[PDB]
Every structure is written in structure tokens, then in C-alpha cells.
Amino acid sequence: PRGSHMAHGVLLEESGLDVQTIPSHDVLGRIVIVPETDFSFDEANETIRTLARIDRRILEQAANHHIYIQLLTNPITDEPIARHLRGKTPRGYVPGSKTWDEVPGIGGAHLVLVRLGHSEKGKGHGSINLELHEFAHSLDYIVFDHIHETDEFQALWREEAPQLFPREYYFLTYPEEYFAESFAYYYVSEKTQETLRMAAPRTYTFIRQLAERAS
Numbered sequence: 001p002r003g004s005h006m007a008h009g010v011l012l013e014e015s016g017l018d019v020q021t022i023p024s025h026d027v028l029g030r031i032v033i034v035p036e037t038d039f040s041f042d043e044a045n046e047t048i049r050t051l052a053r054i055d056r057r058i059l060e061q062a063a064n065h066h067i068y069i070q071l072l073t074n075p076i077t078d079e080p081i082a083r084h085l086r087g088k089t090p091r092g093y094v095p096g097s098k099t100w101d102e103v104p105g106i107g108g109a110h111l112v113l114v115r116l117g118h119s120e121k122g123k124g125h126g127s128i129n130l131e132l133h134e135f136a137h138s139l140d141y142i143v144f145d146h147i148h149e150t151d152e153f154q155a156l157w158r159e160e161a162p163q164l165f166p167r168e169y170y171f172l173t174y175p176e177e178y179f180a181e182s183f184a185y186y187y188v189s190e191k192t193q194e195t196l197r198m199a200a201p202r203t204y205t206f207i208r209q210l211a212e213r214a215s
């Protein structure tokens, strides 16, 4: 007997997956959607533990805005709301060099999609951490009302992105990318956070106090 509450994915808190030792699992349990078919517990656990590095208040903001992060085993282009992307070139790639079938995440809307097994840099994307980068887009646009467009953030981007991302075109020249990748550096590890702090100290402080900038 399969219930319709699990037919299209399972909310983490309803999944029976054991997350009791994960910080903020009470909040993440209402944000993360896991597959209703077989998936790797190790891959899901690592993704959820990375998201649990985020300031609890930001997670609460995301939950109260009803942002969800759906973890997938199959490609994003098998989801009906992304089916139009099958076989198409993603913006910014040379045609023939990439299709949306090969893109493992999408962020910015109230539903974030992340395919399991692709977190690290180079696995179909160029971010230090796929799930933090994509979630940061949705935070930026929804919780923080396009904060990458504010005068304060624009000035951080101008002054510090050339120091932090001199060799990474999209993180250097797109303010929404600078926001999302800076967020991922702050939260993926202590080592990347200290890299951010040394190369881009004002951006570091901006991310550290981000929770006080919501709307």
C-alpha cells in the first residue's frame, strides 16, 4: 500500500531516514524531499549534513517561506516541470558541448532540484558545492529579495570578486553567482570559509550576518 503523500517524493521528516544526529534536523525535515524510489543513504546523508552547516535561522527563514530542496536519483529533465529542457543546450554553454540532461541542479525558485552524487566541483557544474550553491540562489531571490542587486552587495562584488575568483568567469562577472558561490565557500568547510575571509573579508562578513538582511 503506497500513499499518495509519497508518490511524488517524500518529505524528509516523513521518510523514516534517521537524521537525529544532524544539527537542525527538525527544520531540514520540512525542507528536504527525498526520493520515493531506491537511493543512496550515504549520498543523501552527506548532502543533508552539508545543508545543516547553515545558520539555523536561515534554515528557519527558508522553511517559513516554504522553500524545498528535492534530492533526485534521476536527471532533472525527467521531472515533468523540467521536461522542456531535455536535449537542449543550457545558456552559457557552446551548443554541442552540454545539454540540460547533464546539469545536476537548478536553484532560484521555491523548489530546488539537486541530483544525488554530484556535490563536488566538476561533477557537471563548476561550484565548490552544488547543494549550497543552488540553495543560495533561492535564498537570494526569495528570502533576501534579490539581495545581489543591492548597492551594498554590488560594491562588495566590485571590490572583492576580482580577488577571490580571478580565474572563474561566471563567479567573477555575475553578481548572483558571486553571492551563491560566496555562500557555498562560507558553509562547505572551515578551510573554504577561511579562504573567503582572507580574499574577500567584507563579503565574508556580509554572509556571516546574512540572516539579519531578510524581508
Ligand SMILES: [Zn+2]
Residues within 6 Å of the ligand: 133, 137, 176, 177, 180
Ligand atoms: Zn548559479
